[PDB]
Amino acid sequence: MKLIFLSGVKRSGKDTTADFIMSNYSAVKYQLAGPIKDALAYAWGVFAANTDYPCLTRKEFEGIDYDRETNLNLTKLEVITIMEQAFCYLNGKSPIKGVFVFDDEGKESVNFVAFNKITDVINNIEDQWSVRRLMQALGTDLIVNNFDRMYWVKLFALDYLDKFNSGYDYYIVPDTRQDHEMDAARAMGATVIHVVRPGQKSNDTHITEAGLPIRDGDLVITNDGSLEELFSKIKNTLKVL
């Protein structure tokens, strides 16, 4: 099995490459933001449970026929509540440093110190709450930035360890968005492929929308033409590995 980490801003051709690889090769995929979306879909169902709030499922957090930039018109209190349920969920997958979950009859809550950092972080976010902003907030604003910078790489490692030994040719991580994820990837001997559209940018200022640095050893596919030109570049890049 060959481990590949893909890197590319929105609409750079990176998502196209990911799909080209998944449909033309024996590949298994793992999304770093996978568990972010599972935790939010779970928290949401706990939050919108017996409310008149719309039912958002994993598919919607996946963006399947749902615009994740849609304003959900939520209050900072609602958002804090959701983040606390998302944390209780994640803590059952892998312990978040400094977080404890307590039960009061099917009512899960985090410890005060953790609940207090959630509150402070959320209270200072003035953006409107979309599925997209909730992903950015859970992933980065809270966890990476305040509890465990390597949590999402840790969950990828547990998955990889379950699968490195199977019959797939490739193991792809298509959504690398933080430099430290790239650092872990290079350390583990992953091939890092950047898909770049000559002089283009991310229309989101969140750190997870920023273009990742190209370091020595990284491969770069310049998407400066047609689609088959891209498909050819992909084929010849992989043929080499």
Ligand X SMILES: Nc1nc2c(ncn2[C@H]2C[C@H](O)[C@@H](COP(=O)(O)O)O2)c(=O)[nH]1
Could you say which of 85, 140, 176, 223 contacts Mg ion (CB under 5 A)? 85
101 assigned ligand-binding residue: no
- The listed partner (ligand X, its own copies, Mg ion, none) that binds 112, CB under 5 to 8 Å by sort, is none
- Least distance between its own copies and beta carbon 157 (Å): 4
Residues forming beta bridges with residue 108, ordered by sequence position: 103
**Site for its own copies contains 88 (CB under 8 A):** no
Reply yes or no on whether 218 is catalytic. no
Closest C-alpha to 238, from 31, 32, 28, 25: 25
Q: Which is nearer to ligand X, 49 or 187 (CB)?
A: 187
Could you say which of 42, 44, 61, 160 contacts its own copies (CB under 8 A)? 160
**Site for its own copies contains 1 (CB under 8 A):** yes
Reply yes or no on whether 68 is catalytic. yes
Could you say which of 113, 188, 227, 241 contacts its own copies (CB under 8 A)? 188
- The listed partner (its own copies, Mg ion, ligand X, none) that binds 178, CB under 5 to 8 Å by sort, is ligand X
Report the length, in residues, of the chain. Answer: 241
**Site for its own copies contains 92 (CB under 8 A):** yes
- Least distance between its own copies and beta carbon 75 (Å): 33
**Contact residues for ligand X (CB under 6 A)?**
32-33, 36, 62-63, 132, 135-136, 139-140, 144, 152, 175-178, 181, 208
Reply yes or no on whether 224 is catalytic. no
Token pair 């609409």 is at which residue?
11
178 assigned ligand-binding residue: yes
Contact 219, 192 (CB under 8 A): yes
175 assigned ligand-binding residue: yes
Please give the single-letter amino acid code of residue 174: P
Ramachandran angles phi, psi of 63, nearest 5° = 85, 15
113 assigned ligand-binding residue: no
Closest C-alpha to 61, from 10, 129, 128, 131: 131
Which one of 15, 148, 159, 179 is the catalytic residue?
Answer: 15
3-state secondary structure of 68: coil
119-123: long-range contacts at Cβ-Cβ below 8 A with a sequence spacing of 24 or more?
119/80, 121/145, 121/146, 122/76, 122/79, 122/80, 122/83, 123/76
* CA 152/CA 233 separation, integer angstroms: 30
Ramachandran angles phi, psi of 166, nearest 5° = -100, 180
Residue ranges at the known binding site: 10-11, 13, 15-16, 36-37, 42, 68, 85, 108, 132, 139-140, 144, 152, 175, 177-178, 181, 208
Residue ranges at the known binding site for ATP: 11, 13, 15-16
